[PDB]
């Protein structure tokens, strides 16, 4: 018999700008309307009624802008931190494809739409036509970013690390709060080399802390293993570092979103000798998306 | 080493699949093939030669990738962001080789981006820290950036940044990172293969040398900029290498590729840098190449020559010694060859000045006198080095009189081995001999006897004394004798064997001198007594043959002395010839045992004596009888018959001796010999007949019966036609 | 081509053969060599060895070694040649005595000298040579001595002569021919 009525959501400004895309589970590539905090959403819910001769009785028609985070693949704690509802129709009937105009004024969007493993932050318009037993729930996902301009100060992380009587190096990260399309420019400054070093590698590693308080599920993955050096150096060698983080598809460093998950990025200076040991040093950096902007000029 | 074979294997596979995507305009994925490709340079398991052959294989295949990227950008099909697009890969090596690929095009296509990218790519080279991969990529870089460096003679696309200053600081930094790693060649790898590291240092050093060839190509590098920046910048890289072979190949490469005039004024600075070299350095070859090319410019025409300011002589000497002073554990042949070059240059660059080479060889004696060395034998190579040393002065001087006129030439000869001392002494004398040396001064008269003083304590001397009469022929009416008298004394001190060869010519040199005063008879008024001194000086020299126990040589020598006395006319010459006549008479009568020599004596005595028409018959007749006495003292018959027959001419009584001559022929046994003597009396009668008469007729009849009474051989008919021909001259019809 | 010279005195009276004579004499062209004497040193004898190999020497008045022959004869092809120095001659230079010397040996050709002055003449159907001194070696009887050397070409019953004398500083040549009787 098919569906009694299909819910189709078309936004009044669903053609503007462009698309930015994000990678979903199983590597699937899904695209949903990019929004920003302070931007209104408006459209028409095309309730395409499909079965002629029949009738769709209902106890109301509404659309809800539901900004919610789902944690740990569980439906019992699906938590909506954004919830705006527009009523399209009261209890009644649907005998044909009726277009309902909806508009949520200046939808507040405190967080960017980010998807992790046990973390899934989504924004969507859920149309709920209350039927007698099963409400037709149609979801229309909407991607949202977290905007911020250049930081006032991006200080130089200039630190001495090494292993006593084996190695001492001065690594200098010129900045500490980079945006997602920045370049890590710095230097590795040897002051002591007594080990048969085989190479130096810098790993951009994310720690996805998930949950609330003691329920800490910090999944850790190395998206990048950037190569700068090889072999065992000597005293008096200076090593500039040049890494474009563009080819990493990074996410902004999110500091304890809703006190249920956090996103932090660490550079790990990994040093390997010929006998295959690894020496690591951890340094936090803040990332943050910056702007879709006309690329030119610099202060 | 099969790892190498599988290495280039995966190289072509990606080499021809990148060109696959190149032709398809798939630039991004073609470099992906190159990215999976240049990661073969990631290995360090290959030999440096093994890696070098692959590196050249890679340098030409990215060249095909280069000509692809060249025709893209050159005609405007420039894919942007390549300077950054290449910087996404993981492996460091493929990322960089693509970076230079984009970089060189950005230099050519964009003139304004020249200097800046030059100051980035070369620093980005230290984006690696391996010794071996570091060398090859930068020599690769030098190939890519070979001619794109700026210069003063630059095309005027005036967006360009960078000049000859940019180039010199560029490659000096290339010179820095190559010499430093080439020393890191020495201590890399495993310990057991230090020789392997150093032999491959002899191989890949030419790669660094290409950078230094890049320096010479820079015409903008003039004398001023080179000496202040490039030379010192090199010399900074000279002093910081702290490795022998690294320093050895470099230094000779600096001289050999940099031209002469650049090395003209670096004499003080560069050789101070040579003083900064290690003790393991072949400093010889460095200075060998120095004076080689320096003397090459000193003897090349089409130029000023050598600037008048530069006194190479004293500056070399002062800096050469410092090279000796700075060095430590040094074999003898080192200092010898350097002094050889000091002799070599000081003659070639200063031909017209002789006191300069004097000082250098003066230092040579002072060097080896201070050198605590014992008497130099022939065994060690030092003998052949100092021989080469001493050989040069004599050979180089055109007029060998300058060799003789050197006062300090004498000290050199003392320190040599007996075999060497004899060999060189006859050589240097032969040089005075083989070239015609004219009149020799008293100073060199003492020299030659001093040179003789080196040799004697052979016929070589006879050749020397042979020209001694010439090279010590003088136009002085007095001195020549003292020259001969010095020969009389000093050559008489040589021993006994030599004088037999030299006195008979020295005495006739006195006769020449004696007849030279026959010429000076009107010029001089003492010549008569000077000859008396000389004829007695002959007697002194003749007496030197007496102590030498010589018999026949003084005989004829007295005979010319008798001839010389009787021809010049000096006072008392008759008795002087008489005195000599008595001497020759006495010597002949004393010891000689054989007969033929005694025959020659009296026949030559009688021949001169007849020609000696100054002995009056108060002296002629007593000597005429004594000649008759001398003949009578013989043994065999026919010899005496000839002698007495010759005595007849002394009365020109004549026929008196002729009758005796007939009598002496009558007591012989063999008829063969006695009969031509009968003829030899007839013709003797014939000669005096035409100058007594009837004896001729009877004697002709007498031989007629005396002739046929014999048995015959090949000698019989010879005298028969002799007699018949004898009749034919008596046939005066 | 045969060569004739004599009265050298290479150590004794001069330094060596005059330079222009020693460029005219070069090895290869002359097939036989003849000398009169007064070598006084192996120098000229060895120098004659350098010039050619068919060399025959007789003793002068002043040569030293005894292995050289006093006189020598040769019958080359057609001619009979005698070889002496000339010191064994009455008042050296006598015309009658030298005519006798051939008359003794019955040769067709004689070489003599010892007078250091060049002479050459044909007489009593025979022909004589006095090359003199080829180094200008001094002589007691005659003051001035001129170096002079002789070369000769023998084909058949016929010998050409070439004698080069040293007057001044040049080579002056006089030419004489002989025919075997």
Numbering used by the authors:
A (entry chain B3): 8 to 306
B (entry chain D1): 13 to 469, 484 to 678, 695 to 733, 739 to 780
C (entry chain B4): 2 to 182
Q: Could you pull the original sentences from the published paper?
A:
Retromer (VPS26/VPS35/VPS29 subunits) is one important complex that plays a well-established role in protein sorting at endosomes by maintaining dynamic localization of hundreds of transmembrane proteins that traverse the endocytic system. Briefly, VPS35 adopts an elongated α-helical solenoid fold. VPS26 exists as three orthologs in mammals (VPS26A/VPS26B/VPS26C) and adopts a bilobal arrestin-like fold. VPS29 contains a metallophosphoesterase fold that serves as a scaffold for binding the α-helical solenoid of the VPS35 C terminus.
To generate improved reconstructions, we combined images from previously published data with a new third dataset in which specimens were tilted to gain additional views. We obtained an improved heterotrimer reconstruction from 43,808 particles with an average resolution of 4.9 Å. Map sharpening in PHENIX followed by several rounds of refinement and model building (see the Experimental procedures section) further improved the heterotrimer model. This structure demonstrates improved local resolution across the heterotrimer. In the previous version, the N-VPS35/C-VPS26 interface was poorly resolved compared with the VPS35–VPS29 interface. In the new structure, the arrestin “saddle” fold of VPS26 is more clearly resolved. For comparison, the buried surface interface between N-VPS35 and C-VPS26 in the heterotrimer structure is 6178 Å2. We previously proposed that the VPS35 subunit could exhibit flexibility along the length of its α-helical solenoid, as judged by local resolution along the heterotrimer particle. However, the new reconstruction instead suggests that the poor local resolution at the N terminus was instead driven by missing views.
